Amino acid sequence: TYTTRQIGAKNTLEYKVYIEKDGKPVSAFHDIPLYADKENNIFNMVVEIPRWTNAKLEITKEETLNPIIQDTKKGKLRFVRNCFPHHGYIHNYGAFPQTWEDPNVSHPETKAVGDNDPINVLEIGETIAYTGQVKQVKALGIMALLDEGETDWKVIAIDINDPLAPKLNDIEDVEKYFPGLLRATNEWFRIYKIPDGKPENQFAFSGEAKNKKYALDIIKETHDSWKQLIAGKSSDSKGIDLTNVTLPTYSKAASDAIPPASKADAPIDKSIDKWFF
Amino acid sequence: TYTTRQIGAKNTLEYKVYIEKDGKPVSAFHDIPLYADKENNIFNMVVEIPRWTNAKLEITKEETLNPIIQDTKKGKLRFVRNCFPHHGYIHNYGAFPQTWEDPNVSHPETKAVGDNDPINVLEIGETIAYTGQVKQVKALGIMALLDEGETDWKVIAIDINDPLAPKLNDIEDVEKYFPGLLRATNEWFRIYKIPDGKPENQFAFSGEAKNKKYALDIIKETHDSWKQLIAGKSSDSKGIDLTNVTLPDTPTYSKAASDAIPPASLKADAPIDKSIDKWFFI
Ligand SMILES: [Mg+2]
Ligand SMILES: [Mg+2]
Ligand SMILES: [Mg+2]
């Protein structure tokens, strides 16, 4: 059973969420199996950012057991800005554990190296998720984002508990039941860092969302990129912390070393409300 | 100075917010002056609903001193649903005090009676407002919504403290600094009750946002309807509570109605049913 352990107040530098299996911290990167049901391609998704929020929370590569923390740039907490007509993130946002966009090789589909992170997942169901949630999802398709010039696939997925899950099996069903969401998704990932002073991003395949079979192939490829990583068979592991507790860099002590749970959400600066056009 | 007095937890049937002056309740409908600065057309806006929220909090006409209370439909808390690509309300939303969309006459611009409420205001500035806030706004323009067949004008306004306020003087400026916003606003008010099983709403003038001059004329009309209402001279005041604490020449003036209000009993926001998360694709 997966739960969460929160250290600190949300929206501060001290905030961390560890995932616990039966009350014991595990690595959110390496210790949650990618497959909840391999035979039926049901994946475990680690939720980082709930729909309609701004705080850029993420599994951190360089801390032990890879807790979810807030991204920073040069000491300042990162909040993704509101880009009209969108409010924060327009998906439940996260990653599949046990995957890696390998930064050391060029991906033939996009002519770019990977962004060094677990492959990202856009979960499109009704219910807003919580940071640190491990949910079970089916993959519907995939989009090829070049994120400041690096391969940054976005899997389009739905919670198997969603009322619509039985009617959603491939990328075409997203167009049926969520008309406009794929367009909005294309726009969002293109422009979301312009308010930060970064360039517009671009997608390979003219922004096309590839179907489920294509997505399963890419996911399995990043999962293999991950098996080379965790084996220490890396030409360059890029400072990632490879410690784990359910599985070399294995270290069963790591789970007891995590501090105990703690605070109410801290205030967010009013500037984060602003809608950019 | 204006403050709030909250009774109960937000997102419950018991929740109420009264607006206070000098720490004592006044009527949110009747006692807050329409104009903060008459000579410069600066209005007091009563905020009901913050941008990007759902709970349909509104001034309560039929309750003494007209506190803001969550609307209900057949007794259940009313939450406006999320209609893609929007999240809840896309403006800080509320009303001008001392106005009324007269329900007893057909309004010439729309050929329909009024929706029996204070004129509504969409405040477009960057900072998210709070329920019971009295802010000072400039009017920029106005749209003629027919909300379930009733005249329901929406003033386009901006907080005078917004960084952009000095650059926003008329309706054309909204399109310049907020491109797509007026178009989205037209869509929002057409579709927002479709998830409630209501028909699509309609606008007069094919949704055109009329300019500031036009807006000021309609705001005056609604202020005049209210002057008649509060004096006890409406042909049918619809059971509205006209009790006030600042208008001595009215039959329903009573400074002591303020003393009768219970003290604040502010509790933490109650949970909202997860169904309200849902994004509706219309
Ligand atoms: Mg990043
Ligand atoms: Mg990424
Ligand atoms: Mg109205």
Side-chain angles (χ1 to χ4, degrees), chain A residues 1-23 25-110 112-201 203-212 214-219 221-232 234-237 239-250 252-269 271-277, chain B residues 1-38 40-72 74-166 168-232 234-282:
Chain A
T1 297
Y2 290 120
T3 54
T4 56
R5 171 184 308 185
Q6 186 172 316
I7 305 316
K10 192 189 260 65
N11 320 129
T12 70
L13 296 160
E14 297 88 5
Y15 173 81
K16 308 187 188 283
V17 169
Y18 293 86
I19 294 166
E20 291 168 332
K21 177 138 177 62
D22 311 324
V26 303
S27 169
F29 197 161
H30 312 309
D31 292 315
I32 302 151
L34 170 66
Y35 297 107
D37 180 350
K38 189 165 176 8
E39 180 75 353
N40 286 311
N41 291 304
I42 309 309
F43 296 93
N44 285 314
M45 179 198 176
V46 181
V47 171
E48 299 168 317
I49 292 171
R51 197 175 66 249
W52 298 319
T53 63
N54 303 272
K56 211 296 181 181
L57 305 177
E58 60 188 17
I59 299 169
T60 191
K61 293 194 247 57
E62 40 281 302
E63 301 182 40
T64 305
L65 300 189
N66 307 283
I68 292 164
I69 67 168
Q70 189 162 356
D71 193 17
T72 55
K73 181 146 156 162
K74 298 179 187 165
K76 300 307 190 14
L77 295 161
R78 169 170 177 205
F79 296 87
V80 176
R81 301 317 283 277
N82 297 320
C83 300
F84 176 90
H86 311 103
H87 184 23
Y89 280 76
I90 70 170
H91 318 99
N92 301 127
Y93 188 83
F96 283 144
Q98 304 185 340
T99 64
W100 198 35
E101 303 277 9
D102 191 317
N104 307 309
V105 299
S106 200
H107 298 33
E109 299 88 8
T110 49
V113 303
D115 71 347
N116 196 36
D117 275 322
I119 199 188
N120 293 113
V121 180
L122 319 179
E123 199 276 309
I124 69 172
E126 307 178 346
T127 296
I128 297 166
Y130 63 91
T131 291
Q133 188 177 3
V134 175
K135 65 162 70 211
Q136 296 61 60
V137 305
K138 71 208 295 204
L140 306 172
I142 195 168
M143 286 171 164
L145 184 66
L146 287 295
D147 185 341
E148 303 181 39
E150 306 182 331
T151 299
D152 185 26
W153 298 101
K154 311 292 184 182
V155 175
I156 298 155
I158 193 143
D159 191 320
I160 72 173
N161 300 328
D162 195 274
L164 280 181
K167 298 186 194 156
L168 297 149
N169 298 286
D170 214 337
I171 195 52
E172 299 81 13
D173 303 321
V174 179
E175 291 174 341
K176 261 199 86 166
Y177 295 98
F178 305 80
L181 184 62
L182 292 181
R183 184 60 175 263
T185 297
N186 178 89
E187 180 177 83
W188 199 91
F189 280 105
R190 281 164 83 197
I191 75 178
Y192 77 117
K193 300 153 155 227
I194 294 175
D196 308 349
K198 290 174 155 185
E200 194 189 350
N201 298 131
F203 279 94
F205 318 123
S206 328
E208 170 182 16
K210 300 296 193 196
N211 70 21
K212 168 178 187 182
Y214 197 108
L216 298 173
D217 288 340
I218 295 306
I219 295 153
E221 175 174 303
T222 64
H223 186 42
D224 293 328
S225 290
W226 179 77
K227 280 166 165 179
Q228 163 161 285
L229 155 159
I230 197 70
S234 53
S235 72
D236 200 339
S237 71
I240 295 166
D241 192 326
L242 270 8
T243 313
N244 85 66
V245 310
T246 61
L247 253 32
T249 53
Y250 174 80
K252 164 201 182 123
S255 176
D256 302 327
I258 301 321
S262 114
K263 281 186 206 190
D265 292 10
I268 305 179
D269 188 72
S271 65
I272 305 326
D273 296 352
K274 178 171 174 170
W275 222 355
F276 290 82
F277 290 83
Chain B
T1 305
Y2 296 110
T3 51
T4 56
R5 177 177 300 194
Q6 178 169 334
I7 306 255
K10 191 174 289 183
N11 313 315
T12 69
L13 288 173
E14 292 84 16
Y15 169 92
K16 303 185 169 45
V17 168
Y18 294 80
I19 300 176
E20 292 179 333
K21 182 177 173 291
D22 313 308
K24 289 170 73 41
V26 306
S27 168
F29 191 174
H30 305 132
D31 288 316
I32 299 160
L34 173 58
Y35 296 96
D37 180 343
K38 180 71 171 285
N40 293 121
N41 294 303
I42 309 301
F43 300 96
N44 281 319
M45 167 188 184
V46 171
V47 176
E48 294 165 324
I49 296 171
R51 189 171 75 251
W52 297 320
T53 68
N54 302 273
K56 211 297 174 173
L57 309 174
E58 58 183 26
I59 294 161
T60 304
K61 292 183 307 295
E62 300 83 11
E63 175 74 27
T64 309
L65 301 188
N66 317 101
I68 291 164
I69 294 180
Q70 186 160 352
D71 196 26
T72 53
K74 304 180 176 181
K76 298 302 203 167
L77 292 171
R78 176 182 172 202
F79 296 87
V80 173
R81 304 308 290 276
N82 307 130
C83 298
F84 173 90
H86 311 102
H87 179 22
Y89 284 69
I90 65 163
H91 332 261
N92 294 316
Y93 184 86
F96 288 144
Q98 309 188 335
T99 60
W100 195 36
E101 297 277 20
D102 192 338
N104 305 307
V105 303
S106 183
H107 295 240
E109 301 81 3
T110 50
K111 301 188 87 187
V113 304
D115 80 344
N116 190 43
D117 281 346
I119 197 178
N120 293 115
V121 183
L122 319 181
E123 190 282 313
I124 64 172
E126 59 172 90
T127 301
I128 299 170
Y130 64 91
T131 296
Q133 183 173 17
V134 184
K135 56 164 78 211
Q136 288 72 54
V137 307
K138 295 209 294 210
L140 301 171
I142 197 169
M143 289 171 156
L145 178 66
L146 280 303
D147 181 5
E148 304 186 42
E150 300 183 327
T151 297
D152 185 21
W153 299 97
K154 314 294 190 184
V155 186
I156 308 120
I158 189 139
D159 194 320
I160 71 179
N161 301 133
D162 193 275
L164 276 171
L168 305 174
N169 293 301
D170 208 346
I171 193 59
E172 297 87 7
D173 302 328
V174 179
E175 198 51 48
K176 317 312 160 252
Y177 293 96
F178 301 80
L181 180 64
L182 290 177
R183 200 184 300 268
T185 297
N186 177 85
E187 176 176 74
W188 199 95
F189 282 99
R190 279 189 289 95
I191 76 172
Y192 75 118
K193 296 195 272 202
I194 287 175
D196 300 352
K198 300 284 192 147
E200 197 168 6
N201 287 328
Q202 294 169 276
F203 283 87
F205 312 114
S206 289
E208 179 183 16
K210 299 287 199 182
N211 66 10
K212 170 179 189 170
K213 183 186 174 199
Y214 196 110
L216 267 16
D217 195 49
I218 297 306
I219 293 161
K220 177 177 184 302
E221 173 217 325
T222 68
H223 193 226
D224 293 343
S225 302
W226 171 89
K227 287 193 233 173
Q228 174 172 89
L229 172 63
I230 199 72
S234 170
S235 61
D236 179 4
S237 59
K238 304 304 195 182
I240 289 170
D241 202 317
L242 307 170
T243 302
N244 64 269
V245 308
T246 69
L247 313 164
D249 291 333
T250 58
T252 42
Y253 177 64
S254 173
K255 266 177 134 213
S258 191
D259 310 341
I261 306 301
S265 47
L266 195 157
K267 313 169 168 194
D269 287 13
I272 303 182
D273 189 269
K274 293 301 286 183
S275 69
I276 310 312
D277 293 356
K278 181 167 175 165
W279 223 353
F280 281 85
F281 288 79
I282 289 159

